[PDB]
Amino acid sequence: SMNPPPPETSNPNKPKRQTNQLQYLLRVVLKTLWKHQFAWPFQQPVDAVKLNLPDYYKIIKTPMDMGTIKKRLENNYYWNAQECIQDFNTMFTNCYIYNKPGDDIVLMAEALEKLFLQKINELPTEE
Ligand SMILES: CCOC(=O)N1CCS[C@H](c2cccs2)CC1
């Protein structure tokens, strides 16, 4: 079995900035979710080899994880906050697509997503 290459976290061809909203996404949003007791499955790309999930990347074609998001924020990969918000939402959606309601991993995603929604509700106006 083999894992795909991870999502890119650097691309010198891609225009970048550091907005107040992106700083909030790192300092408040990512930090809050990263320290949570349920963060660990989401802190790096899904290792379908180690987890013995050969169908994971057959089903999930747009993988995303908080390790990738963390590096994107720290490396100033994004142009705007919406790109990063979309990455978080992709991560949660992949979890709900692949897994079953009530699975431990889904309960973990739901807890992180609740905090995500609480923090992005107060995303500062641009700036
Ligand atoms: C981060 C998204 O991870 C996943 O969706 N998978 C698919 C099967 S659940 C498995 C785990 C269950 C409980 C702890 S880790 C993680 C990998």
Q: What is the resolution of the experimental data for this entry, in Å? A: 1.3
76: left (phi over 0), alpha (psi -120 to 50) or beta: left
Inter-residue contact 16 to 84 (CB < 8 Å):
no
- Reference 38, options 101, 116, 94; nearest CA is 116
At residue 88, φ and ψ (nearest 5 deg) are: -60, -45
What are the Cα distances from residue 33, in Å, to 2, 60, 107? 28, 22, 14
User: Nearest to residue 22, comparing CAs of 65, 62, 93, 75?
Assistant: 75
Domain boundaries of the chain, sorted by first residue: 19-123
CB of 49 shorter than 6 A to ligand 1: no
Host H or E run for residue 34: helix 31-34
DSSP 41: G
Query: Which residue, by CA, sits nearest to atom 13 of ligand 1?
Result: 105
Q: Among 3.40.50.300, 3.30.1330.10, 3.40.50.720, 1.20.920.10, name the CATH number for the domain at 19-123.
A: 1.20.920.10
Of 8, 56, 44, 31, residue with least CA distance to 112: 31
Does ligand 1 lie within 6 Å of residue 99's CB atom? yes
The 8-class DSSP code of residue 118 comes to: H
Would you state the structure tokens that stand for residue 119, as one six-digit string? 């923090």
Q: DSSP H helical segments within 40-125, as ranges?
A: 56-59, 66-74, 81-98, 104-120
